Amino acid sequence: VDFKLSPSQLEARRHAQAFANTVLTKASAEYSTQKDQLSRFQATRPFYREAVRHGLIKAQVPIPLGGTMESLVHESIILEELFAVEPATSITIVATALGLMPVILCDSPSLQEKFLKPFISGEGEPLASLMHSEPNGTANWLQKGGPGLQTTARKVGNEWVISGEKLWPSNSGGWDYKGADLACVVCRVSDDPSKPQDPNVDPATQIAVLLVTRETIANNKKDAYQILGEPELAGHITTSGPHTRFTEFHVPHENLLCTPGLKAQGLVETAFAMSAALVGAMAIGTARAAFEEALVFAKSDTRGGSKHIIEHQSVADKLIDCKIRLETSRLLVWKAVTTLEDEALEWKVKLEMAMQTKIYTTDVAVECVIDAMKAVGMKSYAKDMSFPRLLNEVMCYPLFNGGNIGLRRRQMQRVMALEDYEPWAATYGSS
Amino acid sequence: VDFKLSPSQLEARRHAQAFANTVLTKASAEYSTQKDQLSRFQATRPFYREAVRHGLIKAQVPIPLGGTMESLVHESIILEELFAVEPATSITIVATALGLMPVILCDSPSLQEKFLKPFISGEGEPLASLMHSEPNGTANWLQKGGPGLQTTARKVGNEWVISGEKLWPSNSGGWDYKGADLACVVCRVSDDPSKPQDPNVDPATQIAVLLVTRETIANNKKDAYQILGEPELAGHITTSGPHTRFTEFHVPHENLLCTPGLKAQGLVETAFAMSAALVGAMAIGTARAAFEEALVFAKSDTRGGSKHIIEHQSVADKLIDCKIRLETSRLLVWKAVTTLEDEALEWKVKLEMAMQTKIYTTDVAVECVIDAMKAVGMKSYAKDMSFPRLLNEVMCYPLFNGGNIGLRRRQMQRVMALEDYEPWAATYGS
Amino acid sequence: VDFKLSPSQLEARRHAQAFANTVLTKASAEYSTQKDQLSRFQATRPFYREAVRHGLIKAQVPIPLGGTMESLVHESIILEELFAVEPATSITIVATALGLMPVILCDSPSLQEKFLKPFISGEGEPLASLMHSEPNGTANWLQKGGPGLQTTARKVGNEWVISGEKLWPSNSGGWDYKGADLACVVCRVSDDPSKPQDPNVDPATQIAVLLVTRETIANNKKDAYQILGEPELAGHITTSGPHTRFTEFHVPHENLLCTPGLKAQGLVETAFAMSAALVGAMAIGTARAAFEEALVFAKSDTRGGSKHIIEHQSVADKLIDCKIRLETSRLLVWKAVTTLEDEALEWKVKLEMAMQTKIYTTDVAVECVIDAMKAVGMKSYAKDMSFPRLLNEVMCYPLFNGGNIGLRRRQMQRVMALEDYEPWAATYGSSK
Amino acid sequence: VDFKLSPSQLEARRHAQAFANTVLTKASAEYSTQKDQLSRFQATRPFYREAVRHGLIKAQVPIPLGGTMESLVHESIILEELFAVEPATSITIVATALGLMPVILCDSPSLQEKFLKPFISGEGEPLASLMHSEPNGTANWLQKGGPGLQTTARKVGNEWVISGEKLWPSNSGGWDYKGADLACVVCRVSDDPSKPQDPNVDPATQIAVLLVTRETIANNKKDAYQILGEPELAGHITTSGPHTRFTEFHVPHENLLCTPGLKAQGLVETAFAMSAALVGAMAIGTARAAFEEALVFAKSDTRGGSKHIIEHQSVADKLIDCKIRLETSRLLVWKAVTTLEDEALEWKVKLEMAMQTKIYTTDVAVECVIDAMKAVGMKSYAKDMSFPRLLNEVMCYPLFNGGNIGLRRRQMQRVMALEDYEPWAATYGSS
Numbered sequence A, D: 001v002d003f004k005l006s007p008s009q010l011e012a013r014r015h016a017q018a019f020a021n022t023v024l025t026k027a028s029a030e031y032s033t034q035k036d037q038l039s040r041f042q043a044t045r046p047f048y049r050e051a052v053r054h055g056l057i058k059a060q061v062p063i064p065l066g067g068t069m070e071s072l073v074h075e076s077i078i079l080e081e082l083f084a085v086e087p088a089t090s091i092t093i094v095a096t097a098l099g100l101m102p103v104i105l106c107d108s109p110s111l112q113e114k115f116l117k118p119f120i121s122g123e124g125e126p127l128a129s130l131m132h133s134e135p136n137g138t139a140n141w142l143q144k145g146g147p148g149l150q151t152t153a154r155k156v157g158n159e160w161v162i163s164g165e166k167l168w169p170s171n172s173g174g175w176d177y178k179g180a181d182l183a184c185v186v187c188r189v190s191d192d193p194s195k196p197q198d199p200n201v202d203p204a205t206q207i208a209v210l211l212v213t214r215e216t217i218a219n220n221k222k223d224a225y226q227i228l229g230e231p232e233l234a235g236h237i238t239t240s241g242p243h244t245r246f247t248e249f250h251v252p253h254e255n256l257l258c259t260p261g262l263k264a265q266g267l268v269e270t271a272f273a274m275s276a277a278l279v280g281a282m283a284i285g286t287a288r289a290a291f292e293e294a295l296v297f298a299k300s301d302t303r304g305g306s307k308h309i310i311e312h313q314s315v316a317d318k319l320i321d322c323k324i325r326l327e328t329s330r331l332l333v334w335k336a337v338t339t340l341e342d343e344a345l346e347w348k349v350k351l352e353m354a355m356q357t358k359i360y361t362t363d364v365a366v367e368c369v370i371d372a373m374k375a376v377g378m379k380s381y382a383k384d385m386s387f388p389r390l391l392n393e394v395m396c397y398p399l400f401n402g403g404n405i406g407l408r409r410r411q412m413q414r415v416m417a418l419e420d421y422e423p424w425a426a427t428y429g430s431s
Numbered sequence B: 001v002d003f004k005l006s007p008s009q010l011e012a013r014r015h016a017q018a019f020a021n022t023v024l025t026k027a028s029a030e031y032s033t034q035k036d037q038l039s040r041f042q043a044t045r046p047f048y049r050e051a052v053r054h055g056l057i058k059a060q061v062p063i064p065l066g067g068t069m070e071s072l073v074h075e076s077i078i079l080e081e082l083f084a085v086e087p088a089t090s091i092t093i094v095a096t097a098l099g100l101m102p103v104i105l106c107d108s109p110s111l112q113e114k115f116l117k118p119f120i121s122g123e124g125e126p127l128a129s130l131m132h133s134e135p136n137g138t139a140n141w142l143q144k145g146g147p148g149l150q151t152t153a154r155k156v157g158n159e160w161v162i163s164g165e166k167l168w169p170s171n172s173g174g175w176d177y178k179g180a181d182l183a184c185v186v187c188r189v190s191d192d193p194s195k196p197q198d199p200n201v202d203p204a205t206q207i208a209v210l211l212v213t214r215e216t217i218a219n220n221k222k223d224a225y226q227i228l229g230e231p232e233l234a235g236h237i238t239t240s241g242p243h244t245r246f247t248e249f250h251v252p253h254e255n256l257l258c259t260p261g262l263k264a265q266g267l268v269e270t271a272f273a274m275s276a277a278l279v280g281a282m283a284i285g286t287a288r289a290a291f292e293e294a295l296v297f298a299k300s301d302t303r304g305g306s307k308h309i310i311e312h313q314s315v316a317d318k319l320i321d322c323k324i325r326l327e328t329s330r331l332l333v334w335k336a337v338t339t340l341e342d343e344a345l346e347w348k349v350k351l352e353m354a355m356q357t358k359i360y361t362t363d364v365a366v367e368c369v370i371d372a373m374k375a376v377g378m379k380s381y382a383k384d385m386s387f388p389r390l391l392n393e394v395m396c397y398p399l400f401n402g403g404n405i406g407l408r409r410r411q412m413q414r415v416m417a418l419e420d421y422e423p424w425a426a427t428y429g430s
Numbered sequence C: 001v002d003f004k005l006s007p008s009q010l011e012a013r014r015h016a017q018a019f020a021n022t023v024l025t026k027a028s029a030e031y032s033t034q035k036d037q038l039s040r041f042q043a044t045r046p047f048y049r050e051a052v053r054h055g056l057i058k059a060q061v062p063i064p065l066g067g068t069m070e071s072l073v074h075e076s077i078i079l080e081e082l083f084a085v086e087p088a089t090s091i092t093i094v095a096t097a098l099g100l101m102p103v104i105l106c107d108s109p110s111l112q113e114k115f116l117k118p119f120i121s122g123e124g125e126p127l128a129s130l131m132h133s134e135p136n137g138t139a140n141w142l143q144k145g146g147p148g149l150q151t152t153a154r155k156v157g158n159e160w161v162i163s164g165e166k167l168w169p170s171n172s173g174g175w176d177y178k179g180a181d182l183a184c185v186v187c188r189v190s191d192d193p194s195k196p197q198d199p200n201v202d203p204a205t206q207i208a209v210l211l212v213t214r215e216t217i218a219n220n221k222k223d224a225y226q227i228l229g230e231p232e233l234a235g236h237i238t239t240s241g242p243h244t245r246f247t248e249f250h251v252p253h254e255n256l257l258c259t260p261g262l263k264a265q266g267l268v269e270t271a272f273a274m275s276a277a278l279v280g281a282m283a284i285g286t287a288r289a290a291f292e293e294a295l296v297f298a299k300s301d302t303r304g305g306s307k308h309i310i311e312h313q314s315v316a317d318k319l320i321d322c323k324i325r326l327e328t329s330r331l332l333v334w335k336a337v338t339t340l341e342d343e344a345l346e347w348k349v350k351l352e353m354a355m356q357t358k359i360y361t362t363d364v365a366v367e368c369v370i371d372a373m374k375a376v377g378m379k380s381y382a383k384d385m386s387f388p389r390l391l392n393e394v395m396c397y398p399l400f401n402g403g404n405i406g407l408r409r410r411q412m413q414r415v416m417a418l419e420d421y422e423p424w425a426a427t428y429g430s431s432k
């Protein structure tokens, strides 16, 4: 057991820090002048171009697939540094990563070569999006006897036809609402969308993922793909994750990611279990920013007293609790990603580790930001400090990438209920 | 022991609700348009105008002083209902209340008559402000051996001369940066405004409060009263609480609220204890709004499943936590204001109850909002729901009106450490 | 609205303290020497005797029914004072109160006169028990399609025959395992106990409460009522709440408390709702003792430093947190009992308030005790301070009288899910 | 970065498990009949004997010093397994380990050879004790202007004389009240113990450690070493940590561990930093036992309903919180002990990490047991389940080995306040 970083991990840290400090710090000057979410998102396009120029999108794709990702620990380090400075553009990078995951994870070299090509070129500003979430919600998307996903698909000739709505998937409409360069659209198979999901079939058997490109959208009637709105978010105010409607939207059969059913469901589950672990690094970067701002302040400011406020035990208690939350969170993320990379472990073990990580790191990042604000005091409430941004940004984490209450805890609960659940398998090995 | 509300308390609640629903809900359409904190505050002026017309400023003044305040429980009920709908203007009302308190609490009939007059007229949009807070902080303003307050006053003939800076006090600059109608400026007495506070004197013995009106400002040089900046706040984005600088600012001795010393300090302490308890009503309003929005959602939305989400035990657990926080908070605020009204209790007993109340209610209001968001899920994060606004608004409460960490817990700790501390005197008697 | 105590409420507090300080403080010297739960229980008999002689058992019974209970607030004050000193015997008094409740609450004077008689005499050491809990659990007793209570009853002739097992009900076996003076035994009506509960019938419609006394037990075959064991508890080590087996136990029809069904469930729900609120006073007593010991310690010990430890912010923060939990807890108990006493409010409003009260006060008392220990430090861990006892005692509260997780949270949840739920009805009135 | 266990790490776990299961499980039947703390401790003597025979005492001493300790990760794994089953005797082993540490850590091979000798032999039942704690408290022992330690020492001719009282240090009086085989007695140097400590002297400059064996005690008058009493503990009821008075107690100058002053305080601080980190593993073992007992119950009891209790979301949520607390704890412990072993890192980096570890692991192990009990419900309150013992055992951890409130948080606070504090040095290296 070993925690030391290799020279390439230290170089990824250095490179990510440099990118964030030299490039991302310029973003706010551009996006703050914009009056709405899409406009703010479009204001970040030049920084995502710089990201691409700096190899950061290429770094979202494994080396065997033509990318430059070295490991999930490198990835975790990169995200913590990026989110420690500015989530604008950083969010777009990870949303693209998630949207590429179902293709990265499929077992089909031919499909991969085709769809990953623009993401590993080091050119343009290509966007990917995993379109799962819906207006009616998704916590119950696999509930037997439930309505299931409201975005359905049916085969017609050599085409699939998508009917439904999505909401929240980052990058989905692209820079311009003519679509992401690659969207993985998660659908429930249904020959008659007017009829309810069959209460006697396991919903996981009915899942299909259909790949939708800008060409796909161009090849459809104007009204078949419609952006109906763009949520104005509390924080991450420069991301795009619009409300999209598909009406009789046609997709070629060659764009079906895999055979509909458990294999499709498994690809979605895997993709979101990878993101469950990595989202902890985003949570850590945000909360670390809050902790470091409070820390510097408490060591430099006496608040009209005789001593720096760090000398007050109550103030120090808050900073201590922040520090501990950040340390345990990082350790858990690194354990989780290495667990996911471990070929000798059952999926069950990986999934449970990734759920734990998502739940802990995202819940605890909120407490960390709030305790930092309490330690700094009134000054933390005004916009000449980072806290107002941080408080809004950090509250996204427990809710997003599958919220902790409806989704992650339920996924973890199912694994623990299994007769062959081995709580410590990721640590002490299996029996 | 009784929890029953009287006809006039129930009518105060109805009147507050109707005012918030018919008047306050209209404010957002006006202030949302504006580009900066000050402009948003100014867009709010017609609504404060209506608040005066509805008697809500009079209601901040006790009846023996010519106002219409009926009791602190009536007050608590009004604030809860106002903040459950819209803190814009509501905030301006409570800041005025606070700015009036040192005058209300002093026992000088001629000062009360002269300075409370606009606030009991029912006319105009008069503002008050208690100007205590400073750029450098105030948690340590009474630390023996510390620098103390950085706004100082010295007597020069029949006048006092103010040198220094205030930051945060609501309404202080008025609507137009020519000043609030009444400002109570809290100062440290210093003959030499540049020599450090004497490490050998108890800081409480050096406090003075000077009353400053738009007339006082108009009677000084332009450069003696400078507004240097206006914080852009996370929430309560329509309030004003500027950075003010006083340079050789002259105030008549007749505008000295009381004898400098323990008495001036006691007046500030008493004002901030009353606000300590009443800010709990604010936190309850904001947190209640969150809870009720989450509850209605949980009972009417299945989130793509077969049952309303209130049926999921993890969801119900959050709402149960929210409800308990609110219920215990309102009980504590009513106990505190009642304790404050009791002529039989000693000050320390009242102070300590007021401190517990500010600490508890403001800390748990935050948890209540956040748990309400977690229950609603991803939808709570977008501005078509109330929560983004509520989240920012709620975080103000543990930090403001004397932050819990630096101020209220230390006030409470001092009381607990006194030799004659009786933890249960407000309940079982002294 | 008003928080002022009356001369009678102040006297009630004075009396409870006097009894705790002069009588209950002596109990330890007697029970500490005993080897097992039952023996420890028996060693408290003389103390329960004094409590009866002080009127404390008579005080568990409403005035209209021949007792001396003045109100639920009086009761709340008394319980807090008793538990702040010694839960031995105090626990027996409240367990009796619970056992009396289904009778107190039934609408039948003739029944009440007969069964409450010994409890209001001011003599002897009569014990009551409400026997609901079972070895297999009760969180799901009203789950439709579930097994239901495993203690069943059937009418044979003009008697009822009880089959099954109870576990946990305080005082149930009496002082000598020949039975409590009054036991209210909650059963599920079944004509064939070998057949499972009908999954199509609402469990609440099958509930029956049978009154069993020492005579009822003496009139049955010796093997019809067997005590099988007595749990060794972490804290409250002087109570008795044994494991009881009923086998073809015969009870006279005149001992059926009311018509079986929703009415019988309603009496049980009402009794446990009342205790749910009053059990907060117990939690408060235990946690108050933790708090005051820590506080006096912090104000008189410098732990080798120059200043009393109360002057350290982290220590103060703990005592502040304790104080706040106790203050909010008592306010909620008084609001909840006062709510339950209000004739104008719907049951669901009273129930919901009682559930919140049980949940909040019991959870936060645990925190209060643990924080008081952290503030005092290593010294809190040794038996020359009260904390080791307070620690084990306080952990009882979130688990007992209907656990927060399986019972109280679920009862509250059901009320919140109802179409006509009014969150603030107890504070601001109904819109109905 | 790597979390894999080596074959020797796995054998250590297996061995520790076998020992706890075949040996320590039998201790209860023996100590449960005894009527006081000292007799309960004495009733565990045959079990410590087996422990020595199994090599567990030898395993407390680094190999370079003649012991078998392979690493601090091995040690953490051993302690976790032992305390998951039975803290009787396990606690004695650990107390001995702390007692040995000032010698292990000093730079005197001659002292090390002489005094470690019994502990590396594999025979008898030798006990060590680090005697720091006192009747009047120790959280303020280094406060300038404060009374300081109330156990003082002075040099008289070629001997040191000890005046004062100790309370709590485990094993301090040995099996029979004639003394531990080795006690490191921590003293404040005072020539005239009637005088107050000089408020102008830095207290750390006055610390001395005197080694005291059964020999030293035998060579002194009986009245000069008196056991005044033995605390009756809430949990860990089979340990001894008596109240002892030294009156004119004579010690040969050869038994002086090192130069009094900062060197001596340094040794005490290092020994207590190591234990701070390792006490985490004890708290994990205890909390794990609670979690596992609750899990098994939850997956096999319906509590009179139709489904196992784990299917209830509120029960699962408690179990989930327990697991995350345990998982984050072990991670922090392993990170701390490896940080402590890193020769490249400055001491304050190691100290801050050790403090983090002790505070977090001990506070959350308490929450874990109580959540476990709440999940199981009323059944958890009776002694036919483990929870009553575990609840009492777990409450020791936040209070002992330097309590979080008075000691570990202030130690961490002081480091954080340093002008050159580097929060992430143990992770991302020092600048």
Ligand SMILES: Cc1cc2nc3c(=O)[nH]c(=O)nc-3n(C[C@H](O)[C@H](O)[C@H](O)COP(=O)(O)OP(=O)(O)OC[C@H]3O[C@@H](n4cnc5c(N)ncnc54)[C@H](O)[C@@H]3O)c2cc1C
Pocket (backbone or CB within 6 Å): A095, A098, A129, A130, A131, A132, A133, A134, A136, A137, A138, A139, A140, A167, A168, A169, A170, A233, A236, A239, A241, A396, A399, A400, A401, A402, A403, A404, A405, A406, A407, A410, B302, B303, B304, B305, B309, B312, B314, B315, B374, B375, B376, B377, B378, B379, B381
């Ligand atoms: C910046 C941002 C980026 C995003 N990125 C993407 C993306 O790339 N792709 C994508 O598809 N989506 C994305 N989302 C959406 C995100 O993944 C959400 O987590 C997702 O919509 C699910 O939300 P939810 O967990 O609240 O579930 P919902 O289904 O909306 O349920 C909401 C709440 O209901 C309750 N609930 C419902 N069912 C249960 C149950 N069975 N048990 C207990 N409680 C229940 C819970 O309290 C839950 O929190 C993004 C959102 C944001 C804001």
Ligand SMILES: Cc1cc2nc3c(=O)[nH]c(=O)nc-3n(C[C@H](O)[C@H](O)[C@H](O)COP(=O)(O)OP(=O)(O)OC[C@H]3O[C@@H](n4cnc5c(N)ncnc54)[C@H](O)[C@@H]3O)c2cc1C
Pocket (backbone or CB within 6 Å): A302, A303, A304, A305, A309, A312, A313, A314, A315, A374, A375, A376, A377, A378, A379, A381, B095, B098, B129, B130, B131, B132, B133, B134, B136, B137, B138, B139, B140, B167, B168, B169, B170, B233, B236, B239, B241, B396, B399, B400, B401, B402, B403, B404, B405, B406, B407, B410
């Ligand atoms: C909308 C709004 C309205 C307001 N209204 C008014 C008003 O009408 N009048 C007015 O005067 N002010 C007003 N304020 C300011 C408000 O009252 C603040 O609470 C006040 O400025 C004091 O801030 P503080 O508690 O953070 O103390 P600071 O002195 O700013 O201290 C900041 C932090 O330092 C730490 N600290 C400092 N000293 C200690 C110590 N001794 N012990 C432990 N920790 C310490 C604490 O963590 C504390 O939170 C308003 C602010 C806002 C945003």
Ligand SMILES: Cc1cc2nc3c(=O)[nH]c(=O)nc-3n(C[C@H](O)[C@H](O)[C@H](O)COP(=O)(O)OP(=O)(O)OC[C@H]3O[C@@H](n4cnc5c(N)ncnc54)[C@H](O)[C@@H]3O)c2cc1C
Pocket (backbone or CB within 6 Å): C302, C303, C304, C305, C309, C312, C313, C314, C315, C374, C375, C376, C377, C378, C379, C381, D095, D098, D129, D130, D131, D132, D133, D134, D136, D137, D138, D139, D140, D167, D168, D169, D170, D233, D236, D239, D241, D396, D399, D400, D401, D402, D403, D404, D405, D406, D407, D410
């Ligand atoms: C089973 C067991 C084994 C033990 N092993 C040993 C051993 O081997 N060797 C040994 O020497 N001791 C041992 N101890 C004692 C243990 O290490 C205690 O932690 C130690 O006695 C110090 O206790 P304390 O942290 O509570 O400090 P104390 O000095 O007792 O202070 C108690 C409380 O006062 C408050 N306080 C005091 N000063 C401050 C401050 N300046 N700032 C904030 N708060 C303050 C804190 O709340 C603190 O918790 C053992 C005890 C037990 C029960």
Ligand SMILES: Cc1cc2nc3c(=O)[nH]c(=O)nc-3n(C[C@H](O)[C@H](O)[C@H](O)COP(=O)(O)OP(=O)(O)OC[C@H]3O[C@@H](n4cnc5c(N)ncnc54)[C@H](O)[C@@H]3O)c2cc1C
Pocket (backbone or CB within 6 Å): C095, C098, C129, C130, C131, C132, C133, C134, C136, C137, C138, C139, C140, C167, C168, C169, C170, C233, C236, C239, C241, C396, C399, C400, C401, C402, C403, C404, C405, C406, C407, C410, D302, D303, D304, D305, D309, D312, D313, D314, D315, D374, D375, D376, D377, D378, D379, D381
């Ligand atoms: C001192 C003492 C006095 C007592 N007094 C009496 C008395 O006088 N009369 C009497 O009858 N009993 C009494 N009891 C028992 C007490 O009332 C218990 O609370 C009762 O046995 C119910 O226990 P439980 O809540 O743990 O439920 P259980 O049925 O034992 O359930 C245990 C756990 O399972 C889980 N669970 C089960 N079902 C669900 C569900 N549907 N949803 C979510 N979680 C679930 C919960 O985590 C719950 O805590 C006493 C016990 C003690 C120790």
Ligand SMILES: CCCCCC[N+](=O)[O-]
Pocket (backbone or CB within 6 Å): A091, A094, A095, A097, A098, A170, A275, A278, A279, A400, A401, A402
């Ligand atoms: C790695 C995370 C992708 C951005 C957010 C995805 N999501 O919310 O599901």
Ligand SMILES: CCCCCC[N+](=O)[O-]
Pocket (backbone or CB within 6 Å): B094, B095, B097, B098, B170, B275, B278, B279, B400, B401, B402
């Ligand atoms: C009663 C509330 C007054 C408004 C805020 C005052 N303050 O923050 O100090």
Ligand SMILES: CCCCCC[N+](=O)[O-]
Pocket (backbone or CB within 6 Å): C091, C094, C095, C097, C098, C170, C275, C278, C279, C400, C401, C402
């Ligand atoms: C009012 C208290 C009764 C004693 C305990 C009863 N119970 O746990 O159910």
Ligand SMILES: CCCCCC[N+](=O)[O-]
Pocket (backbone or CB within 6 Å): D091, D094, D095, D097, D098, D170, D275, D278, D279, D400, D401, D402
């Ligand atoms: C690692 C040693 C723990 C046993 C005693 C700890 N202590 O309290 O100092």
